[PDB]
């Protein structure tokens, strides 16, 4: 019990879930309203994606997704079929980004990225021709239209000076034509969130919400226009980007922080920004368990209170080490290799201390995680008239999908949390192009 009483202070009752659903609720009213929205936490950022879309052009579209740790580049074919538009990803390209561009300047960074479309332009006899670019970029962004806006901060550890005030769009094409190899039409800028919302538009109209919960955090949904007041109008909905990842940063998770939350954020690339996201994202839940791991040392109850030199460096616990920790079979063989890995010896219980280690670590995110959403889908039942409000919920990134109970657990507590709603949860596949394109496709016959 000296170890599950260390671990018991990462448990949330009904109660406390309840309490964070209800202060999330909160903060996307205050995000909304014009009076708030300077100084709150949820940005509730509207992204001019639309209830309405009359145009749509057929075709071939490129995309891009910045904003995972990498930088991919792809080909999507945009067609027509009954009640909507189709996609698919033909051509893609990943590539890394060098330590050094993310740590110089935007265009040191920007210049990077012009050089890797071209890179695929070449490989697949493309580079004669200029197509609309549709791209995705998973960072906090305050539009003026669905291809203007300016890159309110990094997060997720990016760092590029000389971005945040700027017009991303903007920056992109000065290294596009900084590099006269290539020209493209720069026609829509996305979230992630959004993107896999509207890739999901096709087989399910429902579709009205989109969630990333993968190295970030962060959830969109189709809002009424009467309450977006930063958008003059009142004519049906238009999707918001809420960057609940920031819910927190004004003190609303304070009673829930624990000292290991205290001890990441204080080290993160950003103290005191993305408080919410850092209880749930993958760039953070590895660092959560390392530091949980360390003072179960410290206190002389696991590894028989000696520390590996990787052990006691940042960022050594990778999130992914979490989910095969908690994959193991019972037979302790992935555990060890882990940690064998990680430079320790561990006994059974050594293994099995760390498997509740990364359980109470990926229960939390699962459930914070969960109040957010609820939050999210009880807003819009706020503004819904049927008995049954019955909503679809796209969805992407590693730590929903790739961790082994984190869905099924996340689920359940988001049905706890939303009664009578009835709520389909959808994995989006290659969300973040296929949106992108399919949200250029419509910019396309509003433009050229
Ligand atoms: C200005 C702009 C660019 S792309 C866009 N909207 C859409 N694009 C592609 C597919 C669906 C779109 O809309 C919806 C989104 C969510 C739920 C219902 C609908 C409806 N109907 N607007
Ligand atoms: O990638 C998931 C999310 O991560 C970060 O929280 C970004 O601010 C957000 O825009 C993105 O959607």
């Given at each position: 019990?000296?170890?599950?009483?260390?671990?018991?202070?990462?448990?949330?009752?009904?109660?406390?879930?309840?309490?964070?659903?209800?202060?999330?609720?909160?903060?996307?009213?205050?995000?909304?309203?014009?009076?708030?929205?300077?100084?709150?936490?949820?940005?509730?950022?509207?992204?001019?994606?639309?209830?309405?879309?009359?145009?749509?052009?057929?075709?071939?579209?490129?995309?891009?997704?910045?904003?995972?740790?990498?930088?991919?580049?792809?080909?999507?074919?945009?067609?027509?079929?009954?009640?909507?538009?189709?996609?698919?990803?033909?051509?893609?390209?990943?590539?890394?980004?060098?330590?050094?561009?993310?740590?110089?300047?935007?265009?040191?960074?920007?210049?990077?990225?012009?050089?890797?479309?071209?890179?695929?332009?070449?490989?697949?006899?493309?580079?004669?021709?200029?197509?609309?670019?549709?791209?995705?970029?998973?960072?906090?962004?305050?539009?003026?239209?669905?291809?203007?806006?300016?890159?309110?901060?990094?997060?997720?550890?990016?760092?590029?000076?000389?971005?945040?005030?700027?017009?991303?769009?903007?920056?992109?094409?000065?290294?596009?034509?900084?590099?006269?190899?290539?020209?493209?039409?720069?026609?829509?800028?996305?979230?992630?969130?959004?993107?896999?919302?509207?890739?999901?538009?096709?087989?399910?109209?429902?579709?009205?919400?989109?969630?990333?919960?993968?190295?970030g955090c962060?959830?969109?949904?189709?809002?009424?226009?009467?309450?977006?007041?930063?958008?003059?109008?009142?004519?049906?909905?238009?999707?918001?980007?809420?960057?609940?990842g920031?819910?927190?940063?004004?003190?609303?998770?304070?009673?829930?922080?624990?000292?290991?939350?205290?001890?990441?954020?204080?080290?993160?690339?950003?103290?005191?920004?993305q408080?919410y996201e850092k209880?749930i994202g993958?760039?953070?839940?590895?660092?959560?368990?390392?530091?949980?791991?360390?003072?179960?040392?410290?206190?002389?109850?696991?590894?028989?209170?000696?520390?590996?030199?990787?052990?006691?460096?940042?960022?050594?616990?990778?999130?992914?080490?979490?989910?095969?920790?908690?994959?193991?079979?019972?037979?302790?063989?992935?555990?060890?290799?882990?940690?064998?890995?990680?430079?320790?010896?561990?006994?059974?219980?050594?293994?099995?201390?760390?498997?509740?280690?990364?359980?109470?670590?990926?229960?939390?995110?699962?459930?914070?995680?969960?109040?957010?959403?609820?939050?999210?889908?009880?807003?819009?039942?706020?503004?819904?008239?049927?008995?049954?409000?019955?909503?679809?919920?796209?969805?992407?990134?590693?730590?929903?999908?790739?961790?082994?109970?984190?869905?099924?657990?996340?689920?359940?507590?988001?049905?706890?949390?939303?009664?009578?709603?009835?709520?389909?949860?959808?994995?989006?596949?290659?969300?973040?192009?296929?949106?992108?394109?399919?949200?250029?496709?419509?910019?396309?016959?509003?433009?050229?």
């Amino acid at each position: 019990t000296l170890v599950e009483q260390i671990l018991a202070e990462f448990q949330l009752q009904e109660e406390d879930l309840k309490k964070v659903m209800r202060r999330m609720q909160k903060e996307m009213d205050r995000g909304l309203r014009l009076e708030t929205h300077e100084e709150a936490s949820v940005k509730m950022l509207p992204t001019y994606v639309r209830s309405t879309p009359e145009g749509s052009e057929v075709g071939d579209f490129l995309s891009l997704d910045l904003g995972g740790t990498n930088f991919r580049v792809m080909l999507v074919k945009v067609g027509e079929g009954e009640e909507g538009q189709w996609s698919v990803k033909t051509k893609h390209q990943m590539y890394s980004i060098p330590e050094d561009a993310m740590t110089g300047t935007a265009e040191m960074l920007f210049d990077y990225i012009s050089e890797c479309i071209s890179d695929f332009l070449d490989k697949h006899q493309m580079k004669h021709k200029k197509l609309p670019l549709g791209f995705t970029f998973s960072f906090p962004v305050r539009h003026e239209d669905i291809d203007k806006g300016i890159l309110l901060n990094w997060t997720k550890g990016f760092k590029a000076s000389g971005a945040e005030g700027n017009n991303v769009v903007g920056l992109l094409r000065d290294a596009i034509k900084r590099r006269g190899d290539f020209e493209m039409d720069v026609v829509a800028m996305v979230n992630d969130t959004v993107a896999t919302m509207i890739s999901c538009y096709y087989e399910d109209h429902q579709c009205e919400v989109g969630m990333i919960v993968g190295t970030g955090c962060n959830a969109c949904y189709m809002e009424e226009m009467q309450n977006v007041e930063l958008v003059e109008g009142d004519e049906g909905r238009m999707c918001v980007n809420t960057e609940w990842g920031a819910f927190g940063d004004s003190g609303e998770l304070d009673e829930f922080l624990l000292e290991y939350d205290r001890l990441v954020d204080e080290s993160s690339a950003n103290p005191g920004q993305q408080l919410y996201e850092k209880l749930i994202g993958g760039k953070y839940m590895g660092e959560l368990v390392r530091l949980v791991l360390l003072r179960l040392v410290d206190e002389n109850l696991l590894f028989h209170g000696e520390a590996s030199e990787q052990l006691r460096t940042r960022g050594a616990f990778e999130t992914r080490f979490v989910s095969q920790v908690e994959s193991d079979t019972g037979d302790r063989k992935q555990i060890y290799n882990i940690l064998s890995t990680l430079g320790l010896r561990p006994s059974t219980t050594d293994c099995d201390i760390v498997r509740r280690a990364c359980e109470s670590v990926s229960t939390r995110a699962a459930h914070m995680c969960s109040a957010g959403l609820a939050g999210v889908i009880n807003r819009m039942r706020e503004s819904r008239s049927e008995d049954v409000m019955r909503i679809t919920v796209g969805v992407d990134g590693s730590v929903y999908k790739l961790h082994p109970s984190f869905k099924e657990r996340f689920h359940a507590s988001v049905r706890r949390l939303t009664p009578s709603c009835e709520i389909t949860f959808i994995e989006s596949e290659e969300g973040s192009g296929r949106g992108a394109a399919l949200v250029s496709a419509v910019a396309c016959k509003k433009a050229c």
